[PDB]
Each structure stands twice: as structure tokens, then as C-alpha cells.
Paper text:
Classical Zn2+-dependent deac(et)ylases play fundamental regulatory roles in life and are well characterized in eukaryotes regarding their structures, substrates and physiological roles. Structurally, these enzymes are composed of a central eight-stranded parallel β-sheet flanked by α-helices on each site, known as the α/β-arginase/deacetylase fold. All active site residues were conserved, as shown by the multiple sequence alignment and the structural alignment, suggesting a general acid/base catalytic mechanism for the bacterial enzymes as described for the eukaryotic counterparts. These enzymes mediate catalysis using a penta-coordinated catalytic Zn2+ ion coordinated by two aspartates and a histidine (KpHdaH (1b): Asp181, Asp269, His183).
The enzyme KpHdaH (1b) was soaked with SAHA and TSA. We solved the X-ray crystal structures of KpHdaH (1b), RwDmhA (1b), and VcHdaH (5b) in complexes with SAHA to a resolution of 1.95 Å, 1.75 Å, and 1.64 Å, respectively. As described for mammalian Zn2+-dependent HDACs, the hydroxamates coordinated the catalytic Zn2+-ion in a bidentate fashion, the carbonyl oxygen replacing the carbonyl oxygen of the acetamide in the substrate and the hydroxyl group replacing the position of the catalytic water molecule. For all structures, we confirmed the binding of the inhibitors within the substrate binding tunnel with the catalytically important Y of the XGGY-motif forming a hydrogen bond to the carbonyl oxygen of the hydroxamate group. KpHdaH (1b) forms a hydrogen bond with the side chain of Thr24 of the L1-loop with the carbonyl/amide oxygen present in the linker of TSA/SAHA connecting the head group of SAHA and TSA and the hydoxamate warhead. Thr24 contributes to the observed high potency observed for SAHA and TSA to inhibit KpHdaH (1b) activity. This Thr24 is not conserved in bacterial deacylases, exemplifying differences in substrate specificity or inhibition due to differences in structure and sequence of bacterial deacylases. Inspection of the structures of the KpHDAH (1b)•SAHA, KpHDAH (1b)•TSA and RwDmhA (1b)•SAHA showed that the binding site of the inhibitors is created by part of the L1-loop supplied in cis, and by the C-terminal α-helix supplied in trans, i.e. by another monomer of the oligomer. The hydrophobic sequence motif 345-AW-346 in RwDmhA (1b) is substituted by the less hydrophobic sequence motif 356-AQ-357 in VsHdaH (1b) and the hydrophilic sequence motif 346-QQ-347 in KpHdaH (1b).
Author numbering:
A (entry chain A), B (entry chain A), C (entry chain A), D (entry chain A): 2 to 371
The structure:
Amino acid sequence: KRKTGFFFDERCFWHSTGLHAVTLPVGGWVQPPAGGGHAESPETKRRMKNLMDVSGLTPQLALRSAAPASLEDLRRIHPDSYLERFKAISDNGGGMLGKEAPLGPGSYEIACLSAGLACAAVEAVLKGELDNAYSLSRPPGHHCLPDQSMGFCFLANIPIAVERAKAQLGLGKVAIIDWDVHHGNGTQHIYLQRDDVLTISLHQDGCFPPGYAGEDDRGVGAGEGYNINIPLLAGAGDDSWRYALETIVIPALARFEPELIIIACGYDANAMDPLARMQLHSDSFRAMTEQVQQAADRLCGGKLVMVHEGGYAESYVPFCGLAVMEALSGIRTEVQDPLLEFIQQQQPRATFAQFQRQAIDRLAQQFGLQ
Amino acid sequence: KRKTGFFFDERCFWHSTGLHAVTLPVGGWVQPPAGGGHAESPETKRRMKNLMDVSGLTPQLALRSAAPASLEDLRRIHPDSYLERFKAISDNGGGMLGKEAPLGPGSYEIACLSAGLACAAVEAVLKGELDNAYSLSRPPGHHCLPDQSMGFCFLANIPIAVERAKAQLGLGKVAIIDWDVHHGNGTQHIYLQRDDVLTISLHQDGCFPPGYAGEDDRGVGAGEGYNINIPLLAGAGDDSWRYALETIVIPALARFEPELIIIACGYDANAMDPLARMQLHSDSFRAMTEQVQQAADRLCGGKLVMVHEGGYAESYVPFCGLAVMEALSGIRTEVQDPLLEFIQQQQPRATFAQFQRQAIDRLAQQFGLQ
Amino acid sequence: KRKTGFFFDERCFWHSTGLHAVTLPVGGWVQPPAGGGHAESPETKRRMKNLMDVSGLTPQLALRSAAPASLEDLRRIHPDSYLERFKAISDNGGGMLGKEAPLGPGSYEIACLSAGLACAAVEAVLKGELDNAYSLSRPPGHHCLPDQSMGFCFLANIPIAVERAKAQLGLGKVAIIDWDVHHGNGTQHIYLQRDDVLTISLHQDGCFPPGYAGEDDRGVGAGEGYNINIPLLAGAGDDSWRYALETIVIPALARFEPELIIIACGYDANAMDPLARMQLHSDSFRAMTEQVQQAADRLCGGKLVMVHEGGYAESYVPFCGLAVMEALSGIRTEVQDPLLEFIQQQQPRATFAQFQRQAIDRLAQQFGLQ
Amino acid sequence: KRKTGFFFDERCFWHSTGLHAVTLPVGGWVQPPAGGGHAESPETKRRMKNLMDVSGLTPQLALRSAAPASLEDLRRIHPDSYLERFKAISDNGGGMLGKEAPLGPGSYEIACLSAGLACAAVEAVLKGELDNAYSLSRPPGHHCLPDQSMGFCFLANIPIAVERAKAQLGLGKVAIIDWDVHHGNGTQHIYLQRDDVLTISLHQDGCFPPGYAGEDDRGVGAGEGYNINIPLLAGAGDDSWRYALETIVIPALARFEPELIIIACGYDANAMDPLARMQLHSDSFRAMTEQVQQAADRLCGGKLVMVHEGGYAESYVPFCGLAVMEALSGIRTEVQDPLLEFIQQQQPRATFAQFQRQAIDRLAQQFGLQ
Ligand SMILES: O=C(CCCCCCC(=O)Nc1ccccc1)NO
Ligand SMILES: O=C(CCCCCCC(=O)Nc1ccccc1)NO
Ligand SMILES: O=C(CCCCCCC(=O)Nc1ccccc1)NO
Ligand SMILES: O=C(CCCCCCC(=O)Nc1ccccc1)NO
Ligand SMILES: [K+]
Ligand SMILES: [K+]
Ligand SMILES: [K+]
Ligand SMILES: [K+]
Ligand SMILES: [K+]
Ligand SMILES: [K+]
Ligand SMILES: [K+]
Ligand SMILES: [K+]
Ligand SMILES: [Zn+2]
Ligand SMILES: [Zn+2]
Ligand SMILES: [Zn+2]
Ligand SMILES: [Zn+2]
């Protein structure tokens, strides 16, 4: 039906972060790994693209790369002191950009590309050249603060793309919905005092950043009311995430009236993920994509951009990604998710489901949406 | 303080199960993995032993191997038709023992060793040669039915050891507590009609076998009252698992009065596990070990055996295993768990904790323990 | 300069062969591998394509896939009894097609694709739509006999493409030059009695098939004089391989006067290869490509097809492949081979070089070329 | 027959060197590896010990660890400026100790252990507590210069052990025979001016250090005549290496009359090694061990120590190591090398063999041994 862009570049798969045993740095009591290392591996993302190819989906999409984000683009978000230190470490062979921010040689130029893919996806959709678009942006962006890398993120991908669109393409109100299972603390910080961007994060209560829930953080000054955190309970599955979208996110969008919806699209709420404890399956992600595409249809002429964030289940993320691209493009391949029925049977029973529904009801009331 | 046995054999690390992408068999829509493959990898278990060595713990334990379980030992549990088919597949190069039971060449002899390590651990403790013991039994046992492999298990390790002890060492009542995060369906089936073994399983509601909770399954005929299932909510952490032990398991043991406690000790309730959604840390496992050691001290002269089951977080399981061996032996090394404080901060907040406490209270009432 | 085809398909990277420690099957005394497994891994070939992309070469080539080779195409070479057994094993989950021929689920359809890429490359060049072409055909073909898989090969890729071109496109004389470091025993067998195809193999003396040199095997009946084996000494490097091309292969082509040259292009003579003992570098492969392209220019209007075979050095093969594609297309990227100068310094000294030159001189005399 | 020490420590397997694709550092044109990384991996050495265990050999050996080499031990070879910089990099998380010397966190203490295992092996044999001994020393030592790391070596293991034995145990003349396939440039440098140690290196001509042969380097001043380099031709196999031992090494030992023979025992001349081009099999290494054990029996009361160096064929090195330990201890297990007959068939034919024999004859004449 739609003309759907897929923005990606081989170079994004070349970003490295040194030797880790899953998330632990090697040394001391942490033995080096015999096989695969850091959880933020290129394979998480490359396997999704590989499955899109063998499924026959890829040739029916508009495939694109992009020019890297320029220095000027980076500077709408990040000060030079941060950028220079990121680039120095990148240029000297890789190393640490403060605690638990490892990067590799040439990571700077690859992070600029990753942000440039997001910039170009936003631009194509805004200019009406595409109906909607997905950016396979690695490294991710949603934890990055202006002057601090965190949670495997080095540049604030979505804010860079948005700020560029506001400066060059007259973009007005935009909503950012972050269903990566971790809290989008970088996006929240950047837009905390602004009423022209609504930031919504669904996330696992207390997961990352650790110990953060955030429901009382609504924004400050002019931005008060324009930040929504939905801390879902660890263990929640398909029913809970879809109910939260239905009850909180879709009504919030209706009230705000954006001209563009952007999804920070992680898959780490999937049921086999080592970096969170949620129980989503590929049909969960397909249903959430349909819900936000339908909202985009009602509110901003169908303009929807999705930007890849997290997801660390190497065998399972591809099936979730494929589902999203199928829902986005309107094209169904012959692929059947081999774990779907298994994960459907593992879903929380009625007691938990109702408990979580009531917690979501209390949040919607607290946010003035019910 | 204690004389603690550690039973293990290099050959257990040589059991293989063919090519998988985590748990998915390769083929069709599942792309072959570039690095590590099946989640049930030798590294999950070998890294624990490696950390015990470098920590200085190993030389303070009684290290042992064992003779494999004999055919006669296997036949107290398993009929010959199953055993012959397992051995035929093992002897012909590996393959499938029905659906989703892959094994490799020589797996039969390695499964017999794994069960023999459990037999010998039970025997050493029963005969008073050791105070307590741990068996690093791979492949695991707690899903195996008499005539059906399941959940990476090929022989019923703990039942074989128990049935041998009943036949050769006059063992009477024994309690089996299974804190692997999946349901011990094999142990439950084998002892379902018996009052001489109490089987207790704490597990994630609906996880594996998928869609099974089990609270109403209490045993049949003479065995009614002697099976206890505790389906904990996905997402539960340290508070919940320890409260369930305190409120249900310790009182159940006090009522039953065993002569030996055996733990089916998996670590897959750890907070980084891809095969479940629980939030335990190394101190959770240390505290659960202390609770059951203390019960063994009160009830059966300190006689406690632990038998390794699951745990698939390759970087994290070693820290959990070390904690158990430290608590079992009474010796504290200088190792500090580098994720402990991180996972403590991710723990469910009070709302969930109280909800899960009330669910556990309802189970204890239903089981006549409150 | 040229219009160069690059024929490849994502599905070729999905062929698997079960669990191996490099080339050894697991079991018995062979411990399962912790990381990567069979040497014939998709990464050997995928890393070459990945480097072509990041170098900027790929968009300057004519990229294509192909229809799989049909049953009729396969049957010009292979009898049905072989084909049916290959397909049965493929369809039943993978397994063994006799000794040391492991394949995986769906390998049949992927081998048909691999052969179809070669068919299409030959066709495009023959019809004048491309000047020259490379096929990234995996699994490889040059060891496959009509009724027997061997050396990781399941279908005879190049013979299938040639026989199809003879039947459908009026192809006459064709020369096949095989510089994979192992002997092309499948190609040699298929064309042994034919004067319409000249098969030339440069290979490591005695490497694979093991213990075979082959210099006295010249062909039989009408085919006598139309098979040339050049068993080079283990340890030989750039000087030796280029001298053999210069002294034996180029004059043999001049005498035969082909209408098309096909290269069976392996990279396993590279200096870091675990499956042979030769000392070639990326400039060796670039120089050999230039030599055969120049011959094609003199003899058959520039018509040259290259078909990927072997090469198992995962970090080094990409640099060798890139060099070939640069020489084939006439386009030089900015990539500099980081091991080039190192391997140049390891090359055999003058004593060995002259010894090997004299051995090549004796062969050229024996073949009537000097 | 013999009482054979095997000195090893789990901690030696914990030394890491960052992210590499085989030997290439990641970055620039080198894509990060999906699976295993640096060729100098713990698995090369751990798989040998694992096979010794499952073969039943290990319990028949004298197993030992050791105290790390002290600062005083290190300072007999290395100046403080080098040692302090090695330790600073080790203590700060790992990094580079000049070009192509990557090390990891804590590598300093693990290198001191590796050297301490060699010290203790030499001591046990010298004091008559063992007949002979093997040290599984990782990281290796034979390339290390006093003030420069090279070729994966950080401390000069064998020189440290020898210099300590000369200072504390009255050791006189000692011969060091290095059959690692690369040149022992560190040992050669350290003893170049000394007549109390004879250093002999068999190595692949020009391999590592690259472009070095060394036959004319015989020693300087008092040390002239006490260094022997044997640059064997790339491609050489069992016949050549054993003939060189027979014709050059055994007569050189007979002339020098040592009180102790030490072997720098690498396995990287094995026929599947990516880091050299030789064709040895497990029986080659067994025969070389017998030759030097027999010399030790004739010359120095059977006193032989072997110290692990290189070997990077992960599936094959274990079989070669097992063979050495079988020959050293006098105990034959039931293990049969599954590649033995294959590699026997790949061996160079008579033409090459005789050529290499004549080259060895010329060296023996040049060294005054024929
Ligand atoms: O996917 C992400 C990043 C999530 C990071 C979660 C795990 C972080 C971690 O493991 N932290 C840690 C590591 C070592 C020591 C202490 C904390 N964001 O969307
Ligand atoms: O650790 C265990 C075994 C748990 C197994 C859980 C995952 C099983 C799985 O992934 N099942 C599956 C695979 C392919 C297709 C459908 C189901 N028991 O303690
Ligand atoms: O690259 C190839 C295939 C070469 C195969 C060489 C190694 C074969 C092997 O390792 N054989 C073997 C394995 C196990 C036992 C005995 C032989 N052809 O071009
Ligand atoms: O095993 C050893 C060490 C041998 C090292 C051989 C390979 C070195 C290498 O690959 N060098 C290189 C890497 C990158 C760029 C240039 C040279 N010694 O016994
Ligand atoms: K989120
Ligand atoms: K805002
Ligand atoms: K359980
Ligand atoms: K019971
Ligand atoms: K060849
Ligand atoms: K012919
Ligand atoms: K040497
Ligand atoms: K000397
Ligand atoms: Zn995330
Ligand atoms: Zn489990
Ligand atoms: Zn080959
Ligand atoms: Zn070496």
C-alpha cells in the first residue's frame, strides 16, 4: 500500500566497543568470553536485515542510505567539549568516554552516520517523498545526554533529526514514543522544558537507568505536561503493553495533535531478551506499530518514522523487526514466527494482567487522560 | 566450617546438541549463528568452576568425580525402550530423541556420568563422609520424564540418585526443592503418587513447560499433599523468592520431616537470563542456600545435596554459583559480584512486592501452611 | 572501464553444515567448539561483500541475483539417484550425504541457487550484456563428482553453468582455470574425455584430495591433452604462482583458443589460510586476475567469468576478494591491505623460488609448452 | 615410567588482548569478528588440558601450580622502565605496550604467573623431584626482548627461569631448543654473548619476525658458536623437521654437553595452523619429544623441561600436545589422532624432501657438525 523507506548502511555494523562478557567489561573476576562478546553486537541488527532479504520484503521497500549528520547538526544538541572528546577517543583507537561508555576506532564517524540515517528518514517523510520510514540506526541514541554517553548511545539520534527538521524544514509539533524497554532519559532531558515536543516512554520499572520509574516527571516550566513516563511492571507481556498504548499514548497524541510521530523502536521488551524482563512477541510489536500508524493516519497525514534502538535477543529480534516492517509497509511475507505460539502460552495470567491494567488506569488518571 | 563435596567431570562439558541460534534450531527462517549457538552451552557451567578456581575456593572443597550411573540405576526410573533409543541416537552420531530433544554423539555416556555425579553426592552425604555436596551435573535432569526427554534433560538425575539411595543405603523420607526458574515436571511426575518424597517447585508462572502454573496439582492417591507448586509472577525478584521459601517451603519441610534435602539448583531465575524473566542476584541465591542449609541443620543433621540444573546467563551465572558454594561451604572468598548493586536497584517496587507477597500468602493458606 | 557483474544472494550465506571444530566433526575425542565452528563458514564470504560495500566499490558494479538452477540443469551433470538423496537429506533437517559430506536443512535449494548464480554470470557475459562477472557462489562446486559430494561441494557449479550454456547459448570451446589451492577433481572428472573444455588446476601438491598431485593426468581418449594439473610445492608464494600462470596457463590458453575463460576462484592459497600452506597475498590475486583478464582480451573479446570456491582466512580473504574485484572492474578503491607488506617479507627466498621455477619449467616441457 | 610434572594454572587462561580478527586489530578496513577473535586465544591451550583430562592421562602426572615470578626474578632479564610500563598498562585496564603489543587488564600478574610456572618446572627437575616437566605457560615468552614485547610475548619466560636457576640452584650449561615454528628472537638476543647457554631455533624461513632467516647469526664474542638458527622451508613436514633434529640439534647437544635441556615447545608448525605454513602432525611432535628425551637421557641424567609457546589450530593443537605429554611421561592413552592419516598423505613428495635434506646438510657443514 505505502511507500516505506528503509534507511541503513553497512558501516553501522562496523561499530565496536571492545571485549565484554555480555555487558560486563573483561578483567578482574570477569573471565574473557570464548565466543560472542558485547550484547550490543552488530548481529542483533544485521540478522533483521538478513531476514527481510530472504523473506522477499526488502525489494518492495525504498532502500536508502544517507549523508552523516554534519557538525552543525550535532551542535544543535551536544556541546563541542563532549564532541571533541568523543572524536579524540574514536581517532585514537577507541577506549572509554567516561564510565561504561566503551567505543571503538572510528566510532565517531559511524555514530554520525547513524544519526544521519535518522535525519534523512525524518526529512523524506516530512517532505512527502515517503509515506513512512524506518532507520536502522546503530549505535542507538535514546540514552545519550548532551554531554554524556550512556547505555551504549553516543549521539542523540532522534533529537538531532528533529532539531534539524525544525531548523530546515519548518517542523512544528512532534511526538516521540519510545517503546524500547529502557527509559529514554536522553530524549526526556533534551525536551524537558519544551511544549513543542511530547516525549513518551514506556519502560520497565527500574531497569535502565537502574532504579528509575519516572511517573512524577512530567516536564518543567513551559514543558510541564509534555513528558509522560509509563513504568510497566517487569514481567509484563502483550496485553499490558498494548493496553498502555491504547489507554495512555493514543489519547495523549490526540490531545497534543503532532505533525509527525517518531517511534524510538527497540525490541528489548521481547520475551527472550537478556537486558530486560518483559514478555513481548513479534505480534505485540506488529500490533503496537498498527496502533501508532493508525494514529498517524488520523492526526498527521500518516507521517510516521521509526528509529531502531535496542534489542539483544539474537535469534528472536529479527522476527520482531520483520513484523514491524510488515506492519509499516502494509506487506505480509510468508514468514511465520517459530516462537510465537510458545511465547503466547507464557503470557501472565489474568491476576497479573488485571493488576497491571489497574496500574495503567491510575497513571492515565494522574496524567489527566481518564 | 563444613566438609563440602564438589562433584564434577570434564566430560560433562563435552555434551553437545547440534546447531541452534540460542534455543531455535537452524533452518527455514532461522539463520545460522555466527558465534555461540545453543543456550545450553558448556560455558554456562564451566565459567562457574573457573571462577571457583581463581577465587581460591576450589582447593578448600572435597573435589570428586564418580562412576557413571549403571543400567540398573537408570532402570529404576526409565524403561528400556526409552533408554535404547537414547543410546541408539547417541551411538549413531547424535540427532533427535523426538521433538526438541537434540543430543550429540556420545551424549548417552555423558548423561550417565551426570546422573552418576548426583548419585555419588547423595551417597557421600548420606554416609556421613561429607556434611553437604554440590554436583555439577550436565546435562540437567528435572524435566526428564521416564520415557521422554524434554527441556534439555535426557535422564532424571535426582530421581535416579534418590531411587538408588532408597535401594542401597536405606534412605527414607527426602525432600526435593527445585528453585530452577522452570517447573520440575519430571520430578513431579515420578513422585506424584508417593508420600516418601516431597517435591516442591518454585517456578515462573507459565514459563516452561509453557502455560503451566500447577498450584492445584498436589499429588494423587497416597501422594496427595506431597507435591507443592509455587508459580511466581514473571518479573519477581529477591524479596519474592525469599518470602516464598520462608512462608511455604521451610514450613512444608518442618511438617514433612525429611532425612535429606536435595536442591535442584538452577540459576536461570538470575536477572540477566534469556530463558526466564526473574530478577535474582547472587545474594538471592546465597540467601536461599542459607535458608535451606539452616533447615537441614534443624531437620536432618545438616544433610543437604545440591544438583545443578539450568542457568544460561554466561557472564552472570558464575557469580551466582560462586555465592551458592560460598554459602554451602561456609567460606567467603574476596570476590565481589560486579552486577550486585545494579540488580538491587532494578528490583520491583513496593506495589509489586506486596502483590506477590499476597499471592504467596494465598498459596500457603491453600496448602494448609498458614 | 568495464561493466562488471557481481552475482550474489543473501540465501547463500544461510547454508549450514552442523557442528565442527574447524574441519573435525564433534564427538569422540573432538571437543565441541566454544565459538565459531566449521571452517566453511558464511563469514568467509560475507566479509568480502561487506568490505566491497564500505570501500565504495559495490555501487559501481552491476549487482544481480539469479533464478536457481533447474532440475534439467542439474541433470546435465548429476544422475537422479544422487540428486534425490541430496534433497532427501536437505528436506529432513540436514545430516550426511556419505562420509564427510555434512549439509543442513534446506541446503539443496541453496546449492541450486549457488549454481544458478554461476549459470547467470556465464550467460550475461556470453550474451554481451556484461564485459565480465563474478559469482559469489556458496556452497562451492569444484570437488563435486556427478554422484558424490566432497570437499564441502554438493553440486558441480561451473559444469552446470557450462553445460547449460552449451545447450542454450551455442557455447563452443571454454577454458576453466582453477586457482583455488586444492585440486579441482570434480571439473577434471566431468571433462576428462572432452576436447571442447580445457581444465587447468593449480594446486598444492597432495593437499586435497589428500595425496594427489596429478601432473601425469592429461585426459583420456578425445580429451587427452585437455587437462593440465600443476602441483605446486607447499610453501610457494607470489613469485611461484605468477610464474606458473605465465609459463603454463597463458600459453595453454593461446594454444586452445577458447571463446570464454572461467576461473574457479578460491582464495585458500592466501598466506593465513588454515586449509593449505601457500603464501599468497592480495596483490598475488590482483596480478593473477590481470593476467587472465589480459588473456581474455587477446583471445575471446574480454569474456571472463569468476566463480567463488574456497578461502577460510576470515580476516584476510576479504582483502584478497576486494583485490580481485578491483582488477576485474578496473576500479581501485582507497583500501590498502594491512597485511600486504608483512606477507611480502615472509615470501620464500631465492633458493626455493628458483627450485620451484625449475619444477614449473619441467611441467611446461612435459605438457609441450616449452 | 617417569615422574612427569605438568605445571598449569586457570589464571593463565584469563589473559586477554582486546578485539582482533585473527591477528588484525579491529578498525579501519578490518571489520569486527562475529565469533572468536585474537588467534592467541585461551582455547588453543585449554583444549589441550581438557583432552588430557578426558583421555585419562592427567591423573597419572604430577600436577602443580607455582608462585608467580618475583620482581627480582623479572629484573635478571628486564629493566624497570619496561616492567613499570607493562604494569601501568595492565593496571589501567589494558591497552598497547607499543605497536602490536596489546594486553588486557591484569595481564601483568598473569604474565608473572606464566613465567613462575616455567621457573618451578626447571627447579623441580633440577632438584631431582621430577624426571621431566611441562609448563603450560600463557602468555608465551620466546619473542620477548628485555625492553620490548613482541609476538604476543610480554616476559621472557625461559630466560627468567634459567637465570633464576643459575642464581639459586647452581645451574651450569643449559641448552634451549625452540621448535615453535617462529624464530626465538628473544632467547637469541638475551644469550647472544654467552657460552653457558646454547640456543637453537628451528623455524620457518622469514615467518616471524618477518623476513628473518638467521643462519649466519652464530653469536658474538664469547657467545660465538653458541647460537644455531635452522631456517626450514615453508611447506616442510615430518621428514624435514625430524631430519633437522637428527642432523643438527642432537650432534650440537652432544658437543655442548648441557646439564639441562629446555624445549620452547610451540605447536604452530602443525599442518592446520593459520600463523605458519608447515606440515607437522601429532606423531611429528611425539617423535621430536622422543629424540630430545633420549638426548637428555644420554647427556644430563634425563633432565628435560618443556615450556609451551605457540600453536593456533584450535581443533588440532590438543592432539599434538597430548602426543608430547604421552611421549614425555611414557604413557600412551587410547586417543587416536583423527587427522593423522590425512596429514601423512599431504606430506611433501620426494623431490622437495631431498631438496630440504640437502639444505639441512649445508647448514650442518656450515655449523661444523658434518
Ligand atoms: O538497551 C539499552 C541499554 C541497556 C543497558 C542495560 C545493562 C547495563 C549493564 O549491564 N550495566 C552494568 C555493567 C557492569 C557493571 C555494572 C552495571 N538501552 O535501550
Ligand atoms: O532451562 C530449562 C529449559 C528451558 C527451555 C525454555 C525455552 C524452550 C524453547 O525455546 N522452546 C521453543 C523452541 C523452538 C520453537 C518453539 C519452542 N529448564 O530448567
Ligand atoms: O577448500 C576446499 C576443501 C578442503 C578440505 C580440506 C580439509 C579436509 C579435512 O579436514 N579432512 C578431514 C577431516 C576429518 C578427518 C579426516 C579428514 N576445497 O577447495
Ligand atoms: O606464534 C607466535 C607469534 C606469531 C605472530 C605472527 C603473525 C603476526 C601478524 O599477524 N602481524 C601483523 C598484524 C597486523 C598488521 C601487520 C602485521 N610466535 O611463536
Ligand atoms: K522506552
Ligand atoms: K517536552
Ligand atoms: K523450579
Ligand atoms: K510426592
Ligand atoms: K586448483
Ligand atoms: K577436458
Ligand atoms: K623456533
Ligand atoms: K648463547
Ligand atoms: Zn533498550
Ligand atoms: Zn531452568
Ligand atoms: Zn580450496
Ligand atoms: Zn610461534
